């Protein structure tokens, strides 16, 4: 059959230009007399129609989104791209490039939705701090240790333990807004207290939007 794949960055700064490109594999853009369209959907809201295009220069736009949508089709690379201007914080939506034949009909095949949350012009790297276990950090035969992911922007961050070797007892918590803009969370794993000084635990915090990968070793607290 045929499939649709989107690309482009998952971020955009306020008052900037969005560049999302949707590619076609298993078919031809020009053949079949086939139209092309883009649809966005905010989280928790209904679907919103952005615009539709033909393989020629024919196009149409939502009057709410008029004079802001620029979509072009290149047949040589067999893909189509949309350019959005004057993006705001209210444009945070899951964008779907929509394969659709009948202009009054349906979007018979849907591509996977890329998450593009418009940043607040404050993208920055994370600050990873170790969480040293101690005698007061254990309750019984098991102990807890983790890493603190603080002062990062924007969502999300992926935290893995020992490059994904440790999964049992690993809890990933949702982030919360701090007092001033930034986010913070943590990821911890529960281990027996016997393997504290004999096993090395390293957390792998990845921040793709800021292009920062931080590996922080977790050790028991050294009293000074």
């Amino acid at each position: 059959q045929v499939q649709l794949q989107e690309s482009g960055p998952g971020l955009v700064k306020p008052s900037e230009t969005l560049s999302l490109t949707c590619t076609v594999s298993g078919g031809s853009v020009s053949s079949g007399g086939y139209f092309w369209s883009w649809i966005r959907q905010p989280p928790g809201k209904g679907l919103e129609w952005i615009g539709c295009i033909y393989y020629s220069g024919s196009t149409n736009y939502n009057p709410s989104l008029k004079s802001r949508v620029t979509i072009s089709v290149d047949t040589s690379k067999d893909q189509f791209s949309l350019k959005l201007s004057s993006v705001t914080a209210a444009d945070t939506a899951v964008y779907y490039c929509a394969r659709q034949l009948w202009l009054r009909g349906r979007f018979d095949y849907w591509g996977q939705g890329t998450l593009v949350t418009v940043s607040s012009a404050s993208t920055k790297g994370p600050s990873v701090f170790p969480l040293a276990p101690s005698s007061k950090s254990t309750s019984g035969g098991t102990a807890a240790l983790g890493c603190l992911v603080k002062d990062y922007f924007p969502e999300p961050v992926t935290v893995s333990w020992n490059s994904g070797a440790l999964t049992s007892g690993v809890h990933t918590f949702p982030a919360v807004l701090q007092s001033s803009g930034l986010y913070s969370l943590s990821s911890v794993v529960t281990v027996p207290s016997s393997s504290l000084g004999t096993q090395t635990y390293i957390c792998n915090v990845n921040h793709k939007p800021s292009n920062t990968k931080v590996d922080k070793k977790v050790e028991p607290k050294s009293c000074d």
Binding site: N60, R106, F107, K136, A144, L148, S186
Partner: protein
């Protein structure tokens, strides 16, 4: 100025029949084709019915649509509810060279075992202190019901400034997990003798303490 009016919430028991409406304001529903979309949370939408009376190949016979042009309301009759049917429903129109979607209707059915709120604490690290920062992390895990209250304590003194906590979230072992963070300055960390986090759950209180050592 043509829009599709769709009910926000529709909920019925499984096994019965339901009716989902899609009402047009200005343009008549008989003017243009109406397409219904059934979308999983965190997944691409899928067309459940099209051309207002006929079905796509793949969906069961229960997804039936009807058109009532007198009241300008498009109806989608769904019978014999199951588990997989709990999803968003959107109706589509065209107006005139401007595709208009619907408001959205989702179905919600309206189960965890009780547990003990294990709480652990950590002091701020030396690396964080070298960055002129300090944060006390309070963690609540493996508990049910997911309704906990956090209250930081300094030297026998409640702390509210810089307190950030997370809503309880489901774990893999069917329990809840929660967090609490206390942003603090390095000199205030050593000002008090001890810092403690108290967690109240179902009346019982679990308290741990940390000290600068």
């Amino acid at each position: 100025n043509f829009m599709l009016t769709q009910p926000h919430s529709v909920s019925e028991s499984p096994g019965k029949t339901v009716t989902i409406s899609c009402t047009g304001s200005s343009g008549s529903i008989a003017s243009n084709y109406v397409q219904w979309y059934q979308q999983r949370p965190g997944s691409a939408p899928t067309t459940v019915i099209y051309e207002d009376n006929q079905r796509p190949s793949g969906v069961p016979d229960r997804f039936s649509g009807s058109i009532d042009s007198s009241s300008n309301s498009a109806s989608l009759t769904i019978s014999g509810l199951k588990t997989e049917d709990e999803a968003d429903y959107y109706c589509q129109s065209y107006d005139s060279s401007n595709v208009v979607f619907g408001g959205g209707t989702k179905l919600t059915v309206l189960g965890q075992p009780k547990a003990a709120p294990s709480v652990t604490l950590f002091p701020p690290s030396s690396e964080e202190l070298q960055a002129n920062k300090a944060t006390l992390v309070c963690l609540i895990s493996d508990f049910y019901p997911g309704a906990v209250t956090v209250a930081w304590k300094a030297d026998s003194s409640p702390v509210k400034a810089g307190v950030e906590t997370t809503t309880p979230s489901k774990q893999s072992n069917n329990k809840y997990a929660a967090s609490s963070y206390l942003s603090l300055t390095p000199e205030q960390w050593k000002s008090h003798r001890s810092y403690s986090c108290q967690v109240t759950h179902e009346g019982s209180t679990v308290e741990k303490t940390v000290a600068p050592t």
